[PDB]
Design an enzyme around this catalytic site. Structure first.
Site, mmCIF file in Angstrom:
data_model
loop_
_atom_site.group_PDB
_atom_site.id
_atom_site.type_symbol
_atom_site.label_atom_id
_atom_site.label_comp_id
_atom_site.label_asym_id
_atom_site.label_seq_id
_atom_site.Cartn_x
_atom_site.Cartn_y
_atom_site.Cartn_z
ATOM 1 N N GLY F 20 0.801 -1.220 0.000
ATOM 2 C CA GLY F 20 0.000 0.000 0.000
ATOM 3 C C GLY F 20 0.833 1.269 0.000
ATOM 4 N NE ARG F 24 6.710 -0.595 5.032
ATOM 5 C CZ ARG F 24 7.769 -0.676 5.829
ATOM 6 N NH1 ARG F 24 8.538 -1.752 5.856
ATOM 7 N NH2 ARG F 24 8.064 0.353 6.619
ATOM 8 N NE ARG F 43 -3.874 10.273 -9.949
ATOM 9 C CZ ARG F 43 -4.934 10.880 -9.436
ATOM 10 N NH1 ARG F 43 -5.180 10.860 -8.142
ATOM 11 N NH2 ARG F 43 -5.778 11.527 -10.246
ATOM 12 N NE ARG F 87 -3.047 -6.673 -0.139
ATOM 13 C CZ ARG F 87 -2.640 -5.980 0.915
ATOM 14 N NH1 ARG F 87 -1.799 -4.958 0.796
ATOM 15 N NH2 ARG F 87 -3.025 -6.368 2.127
ATOM 16 N N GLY F 89 2.023 -6.902 2.711
ATOM 17 C CA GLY F 89 1.474 -5.870 3.567
ATOM 18 C C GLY F 89 1.408 -6.301 5.015
ATOM 19 C CD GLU F 181 -5.176 -2.305 0.592
ATOM 20 O OE1 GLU F 181 -4.533 -3.202 1.201
ATOM 21 O OE2 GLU F 181 -5.387 -1.173 1.083
ATOM 22 C CG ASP F 204 -2.466 -3.659 15.472
ATOM 23 O OD1 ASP F 204 -2.245 -3.128 16.582
ATOM 24 O OD2 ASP F 204 -2.022 -3.213 14.399
#
Lengths: 236, 236, 236, 239, 236, 235
Positions: F20, F24, F43, F87, F89, F181, F204
């Site tokens: 995301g 990173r 962007r 992905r 994350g 995502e 978490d």
């Protein structure tokens, strides 16, 4: 007032009520078929009347157009006025290939595009279902009067001016016999109160093939339907 | 007749129409605020009138109760009668902690539990949104009249006799200012016809605190609301 | 094979068919109540039989458990085998405070948590509705046999092992008399083919108060129900 | 977060003015700060989502990127209203249009926004919750444009989760009901402003006509942007 | 009985169970591939058996047709019979342009038109997902047997006789490899009980091109699929 | 060559890691890619192409939420002819047997988004990881002696959830990861006949309120990125 929408006092309605959308038609029914009728409501022009038919107490009142309107009036009639039986009387269109203008349709259950019944049953399919004794009384009354009837499903829409492609063809494929705007809101309210409801309608138009009853045919259909309903009240 | 629900002929309605649910309140508005007034509809008791307010042609007509009912009348007014602007006037409840009975609410958009707008937009969220010129005319008219107003969202329900746990608390959390039964059905019809609509309502009841407007308060609030609406028509 | 799920030839089924979920119960019905009965299907163990009852042609066949299963078998029976009437026979739970274990329930319409009927009617509420002639024949047969009946709505769930909080209480509030798993799938298929269907069930359990019928009460209830259904076929 | 005021923003409490302009592209937020804000300071850099605080004609004003889509703006705006005590957010950006009387280079002021997202149904027990702009914000944008003699279109937006739509019939339905702007974020912003008792609005310039396929040239897009940002900045002085 | 639908005593089912819709196919699997086999269920004709494959206890049982049917049997197997792993085996259609009749499909997850999984996850999208250890054991078994496999998504429908325009083309666009009726109901039940499930199927028909496997092809594919499944049980 | 990416076809490798946070993405390229070139910064959404142990590999940010990843992933598969996206994350968990620092390999992801219903006629379309990708991640972790949890994720549109009962249902059905995502990525890969997967580390525990320390987040990130990089060699 006893409710926000009705000036009648508790007891002013009989336990059996006929209801139609047009309050001026409710008045015509009272004037032409009830004896010793008295007007008991005129709030919002939604005329209601109480008299007798062949000695038995009976009321007639308008319900306005659409599920939200009938829901207000019927909820009040069952809850506040302690009504036990409501028969909705009206006109309808049909899509069924073997139903014709001038036919009399006795409704066993009604589909809808409204969300009101999903909201009563945790989002599930809750069939708006007429009470069997009411259905049977209407069927038997028409037989005794030698008036042919069609018995089956209605569809109650929120949108008179439909723009929905394919709806009529699907209703026809599954043999819905009547298209109107209120019955699917009435039946679950009767259920909530442990009471009874039904519906009888005359076909004014064929939605598919575009036949339309003449004014004279509509008057004859109306007279037949109303006599069926009135005679059924004597058995309820 | 020009429509199944309206005996008026094309031209009998002004380009701007005030509408309220109760046809007897439509008559009160015509009797007390219109000059040169004539009755243009009485089908189904749904009284409608055309006259002038401060010299400008204006109509006022009942719409009955609920989205299906207003949808019939408004579709016809825009399509058949070529009306350009409908302003709904009425009473409402509130859940908002900073709105009080007697308050006047100008509606910018309205939520709903009806399916009618999902059906118009491929199942998606279609905000029933008031026309900005109409909102602005109401806001500016109130300021010019020294009448404070609440401006914000309404919620239009199909079910007056709600049994839905948690609804009022959610409406309050997002500062919905008015709870009524029709505006969410009107605004998308105006959109379809490239026309204009808005709504203004008086708070009769606080649904959370259970406060209720006295008869005196309801008269005051009606007088404020109707003056705002009438003065707004002169700017439209 | 005439269908992927049935080895019977076209013509091997009578125009009227009783169906139950358990094929071994279909066999018990054939063995104990049909004359000159022959087995016409055994594909997937879903036993079906054709013979006569009091000399009138009659078939009996299992339908398996759940809407998808009955939908396969009933679609084929109406379409390929040209069946005219199906009466579903079975057991049910009840939540209604005035329905008791051993009661016989004649179904007028059935709700559901399945999507199959929304998919037939453009996402709308399509009531799975029994044919009135079938309902009436069941009611009148029970009267002739002096067996009391409950007549009203069923609810057909996809999930026997329900974990859904609040469902039973809502079903009870609206006086659903029978909870089962199939009837809501059967009735719309009958409609599609312009044919007839109904359902009769006996109450084995009270879902709310937890009464449960003994094995012996279950046998007596079954005997009553099956005699009602068989006698009803003679009127249809 | 371990040390930051939120998991996605390194600004300290008080680093944002009460009024914030937001756009999807953080580099556009930087261009707005560089060219229109005085006394400006960068207050966020997390995830590259640049945000800045300074003044516009003497009044405190912030500008910050929000990223693409309802979930992204929802994170940033929830934090701005809750943690940073912001009172007014005006979203500024570009849009497509399907309306037959809206053209490329038009400036659209959004009164409410529809959506194909589930976020608003989830806030209102599954019902229709209109994502509605604050009227004082709408009016300030309209009046600022009138004072600058810049024509505007005022009306509904539609906020989609899917930039690369494959959905047949959508554009025709949006056109039939006179939706003036198609974008990806406003429908997520307005209900969060409601939750916090705060204000939000949106103004966008039309870059493309989705039906006719007209498309603004780069020079038309620069003029459109300058008009829009001037309208928004002047509106902040009245809010 | 241990459950309403199964006469086996607790312990009579092995910790791993293969299930297929047709109980006669369950019997074929038992007869031809299990040693020491005994029948452990006969209720509703839903034959179930327990034996050994290469020395290790294994059960096989029918599950009937559709999500509601498999849900009953699987819920009972995990909860009452303490089964740890269920591998569904069966036949399927395919829509994928790179999948052909005769192919063996190992299912990683399954979509559905049923509501059962939305009802488990607050109305949201809950992917019916096979257990990774099971998928891996099937993939590795096929590799060891030198049988190629397709690995990917299934779609579990409630309606065998689909009338739904555009469904097959959407499934093909997203490379669903198998169309069947049950897997999407099995995987979430395994999740609920902290247990394991998977599915392997043989392609009988191409829904898009209309190719159909010959009888010899169906035998070859069945032999491949069942050997993959049996070998996988030795590693589970 | 797109409104959101200045790269041209051939500028991305056939295999792409995405996270995301574009910063990173830069950290991954700087510390793990050889001969890395920046190929996008539109962007601020930084993307890079280099090699990992000799094989072409790219790494690029995807922003937050399903709509954002959908833009970037649609373009990568369509315009840039990418074949595999992994992905990488962080996630929360509600599962009683998953703990902070655990590494989660996603087989499928649920969601509260409407994007997948809109692709499949309103029905349930499982966002499903490609099996070769899942297997490569699992085997790479095995080779590195790092324990993993393998199972379902849940992708939400709303970070600041107010929804009662959601965590308890996710736990009952053993969803191992909560993020924003993956449920949008997998169906786009399906549309283009391509491959996708996801791996995340638990920062978490949503139920117990345990949270990873700064040191623990570094160890977890290093473990996860090594697993993903080694998996690309087998893909």
């Amino acid at each position: 007032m006893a409710t926000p929408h009705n000036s009648a006092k508790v007891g002013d309605f009989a336990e059996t009520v006929l209801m139609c959308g047009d309050p001026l038609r409710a008045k015509l029914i009272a004037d032409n078929y009830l004896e010793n009728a008295k007007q008991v409501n005129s709030v919002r022009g939604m005329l209601g009347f109480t008299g007798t038919y062949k000695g038995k107490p009976l009321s007639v009142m308008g319900h306005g157009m659409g599920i939200p309107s009938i829901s207000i009036y019927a909820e009040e009639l069952y809850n506040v006025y302690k009504v036990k039986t409501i028969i909705r009387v009206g006109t309808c269109g049909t899509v069924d290939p073997n139903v014709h203008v001038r036919d009399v349709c006795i409704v066993t259950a009604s589909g809808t595009d409204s969300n009101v019944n999903r909201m009563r049953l945790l989002g599930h399919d809750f069939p708006a279902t007429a009470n069997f004794e009411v259905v049977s009384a209407l069927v038997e009354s028409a037989k005794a009067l030698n008036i042919p009837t069609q018995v089956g499903k209605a569809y109650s829409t929120d949108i008179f001016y439909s723009k929905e492609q394919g709806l009529n063809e699907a209703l026809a494929q599954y043999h819905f016999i009547a298209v109107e705007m209120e019955s699917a809101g009435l039946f679950p309210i009767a259920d909530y109160y442990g009471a009874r409801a039904g519906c009888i309608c005359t076909v004014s138009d064929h939605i598919i093939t575009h036949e339309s009853a003449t004014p004279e045919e509509r008057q004859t259909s109306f007279q037949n339907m109303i006599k069926i309903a009135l005679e059924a009240t004597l058995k309820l």
